[PDB]
Design an enzyme around this catalytic site. Structure first.
Site, mmCIF file in Angstrom:
data_model
loop_
_atom_site.group_PDB
_atom_site.id
_atom_site.type_symbol
_atom_site.label_atom_id
_atom_site.label_comp_id
_atom_site.label_asym_id
_atom_site.label_seq_id
_atom_site.Cartn_x
_atom_site.Cartn_y
_atom_site.Cartn_z
ATOM 1 N NE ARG A 162 -3.044 1.295 3.182
ATOM 2 C CZ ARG A 162 -4.060 1.364 4.033
ATOM 3 N NH1 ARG A 162 -5.314 1.314 3.577
ATOM 4 N NH2 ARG A 162 -3.817 1.461 5.341
ATOM 5 C CG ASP A 443 -5.576 3.152 9.876
ATOM 6 O OD1 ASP A 443 -6.595 3.803 10.169
ATOM 7 O OD2 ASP A 443 -5.497 2.508 8.818
#
Ligand SMILES: [Ca+2]
Ligand SMILES: [Ca+2]
Length: 529
Positions: A162, A443
């Site tokens: 990612r 996150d």
């Protein structure tokens, strides 16, 4: 000013940089930056213009001119063999030990993250590339202080990288005095160092792309990928990407995104936190679009269920994967708490599988066997649910996708948002963007929705359910109070050894400003070396 087509580097060229930023790697990176940065900047500028039109009272909807694309039959180029079964994927940091543990989890895929779960320190991005290269080559190993060695088991999970999103700079590498796109930095180096080994072992260079807002942004990615493929004489569609639909503008352009990226795309994902964060940012000026406690804005709410159903139908129409969302629980020593957690995970994954999702997400290897069992049970002998067309569903409309859900704006909710966001930020500024907080692996999106919801309530001068008008002054009062709660929970040592005052300051800055800033990671990144 000079017409230079070369890059500048702000950090010393040490041993780590010598491994990753080789002459050849830097040549390739330079080419991508000079070829693609101007368009990337134009896309960022287009975002501003689109947002202004929404602010000015025209709600988003599907695109009229591209009707012919949506109402034609066509499919994505294809899916490689090792991406045909993705029933569970684990996400996590590019730190060395974590890479090994994730690759060893009982899951199909590991998404190594340079994005929301990474505080993008230069050393951490460089170490991340080192780690992933060692992972691809099968040699990655780690020995802890206790003398325990960690190594790859046979048949590790498929690796996908990612990258940072389009808005993020990599400030340690510049072109014409300006930071290059982090997206290009992360993509270039992972692709460059690994494409040969990945292809040789029956895999490929695979990416996760976050926070896309438009099909034009997908088109830019297709050009970047095609450029990279051509440069090393690879066939079209060698690079494969999975693209998160986690912004409100993107939910109206899923089919155009699939089309624009058709050579390279293999799936889209549902999210929760980034999506509702984006909902608020997008609809920031709309007094009738205020969401209640983000804790209560669950995926089963009508607008989120509509989003889920539309995404699955659209993906399967085009032969692409439709990935479900995240179960970020961290198992504890409390077996009773664990039973309740596993029951919740089972309920939520069953909902996704029953809706037609091809796979789903976890953050901790301790959830792998449970999540896998739900999907194993429902899939039977199937590898995926590509055949689930959802043809029985009525059309899904902009009204449906935009409808704010029922719920309360509560003091308890607000205080919790403050505690979680402050603790997230404290860790992030200390170099850790993947943060255990109250049994969840959090996150940046969690901090984002937390601060953004509060901003929304202040902006539209909303009351809490107990009648208290939400104001900047109320927020500041609560912030001070909740800092004391954090101190009591962590204890005097940990709290004193931390960066909680700096974190509270950043929280106040991003929450009490008149203008709703796009991303907390932008001011935050200034605090990193
Ligand atoms: Ca304008
Ligand atoms: Ca996200």
């Amino acid at each position: 000013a000079t017409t230079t087509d070369e890059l500048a580097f702000t950090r010393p060229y040490g041993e780590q940089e010598k491994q990753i930023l080789t002459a050849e790697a830097v040549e390739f990176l330079t080419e991508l930056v000079t070829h693609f940065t101007p368009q990337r900047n134009k896309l960022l500028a287009a975002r501003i213009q689109q947002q202004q039109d929404i602010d000015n009272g025209t709600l988003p909807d599907f695109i009229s001119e591209t009707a012919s694309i949506r109402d034609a039959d066509w499919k994505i180029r294809g899916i490689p063999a090792d991406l045909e079964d993705r029933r569970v994927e684990i996400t996590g940091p590019v730190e060395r030990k974590m890479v090994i543990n994730a690759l060893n989890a009982n899951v199909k895929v590991f998404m190594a993250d340079f994005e929301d779960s990474l505080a993008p320190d230069w050393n951490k991005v460089i170490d991340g590339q080192i780690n992933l290269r060692d992972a691809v080559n099968g040699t990655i190993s780690y020995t802890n202080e206790a003398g325990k060695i960690y190594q790859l088991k046979p048949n590790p999970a498929v690796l996908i990288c990612r990258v940072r999103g389009l808005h993020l700079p990599e400030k340690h590498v510049t072109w014409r005095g300006e930071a290059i796109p982090g997206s290009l930095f992360d993509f270039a180096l992972y692709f460059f160092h690994n494409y040969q080994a990945l292809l040789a072992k029956g895999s490929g260079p695979y990416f996760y792309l976050p926070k896309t807002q438009s099909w034009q942004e997908a088109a830019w990615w297709s050009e970047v990928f095609s450029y990279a493929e051509d440069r090393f004489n690879l066939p079209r569609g060698t690079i494969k990407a999975t693209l998160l639909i986690e912004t409100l503008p993107a939910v109206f352009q899923m089919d155009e995104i699939l089309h624009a990226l058709r050579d390279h795309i293999v799936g889209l994902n549902c999210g929760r936190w980034d999506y509702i964060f984006s909902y608020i940012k997008t609809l920031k000026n709309y007094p009738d679009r205020v969401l209640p406690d983000r804790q209560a804005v669950t995926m089963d709410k009508p607008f989120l269920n509509a989003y889920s159903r539309l995404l699955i139908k659209t993906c399967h129409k085009r032969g692409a994967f439709a990935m479900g969302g995240m179960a970020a629980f961290i198992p504890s020593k409390d077996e009773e708490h664990n039973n309740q957690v596993l029951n919740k995970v089972k309920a939520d994954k069953s909902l996704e599988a029953n809706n037609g999702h091809d796979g789903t997400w976890i953050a901790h290897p301790g959830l792998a066997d449970t999540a896998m069992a739900v999907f194993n049970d429902i899939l039977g002998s199937r590898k995926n649910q590509l055949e689930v067309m959802r043809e029985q569903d009525a059309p899904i409309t902009a009204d449906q996708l935009l409808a704010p859900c029922d719920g309360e704006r509560t003091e308890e909710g607000m205080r919790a948002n403050i505690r979680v966001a402050v603790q997230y930020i404290e860790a992030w500024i200390s170099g850790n963007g993947c943060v255990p907080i109250y049994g969840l692996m959090e996150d940046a999106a969690t901090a984002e929705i937390s601060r953004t919801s509060i901003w929304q309530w202040i902006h539209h001068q909303k009351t809490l359910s107990n009648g208290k008008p939400v104001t900047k002054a109320l927020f500041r009062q609560m912030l001070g109070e909740e800092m004391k709660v954090i101190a009591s929970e962590l204890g005097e040592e940990r709290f004193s050894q931390g960066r909680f005052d700096d974190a509270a300051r950043l929280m106040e800055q991003i929450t009490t400003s008149d203008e709703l800033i796009d991303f907390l990671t932008l001011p935050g990144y200034r605090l990193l070396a």
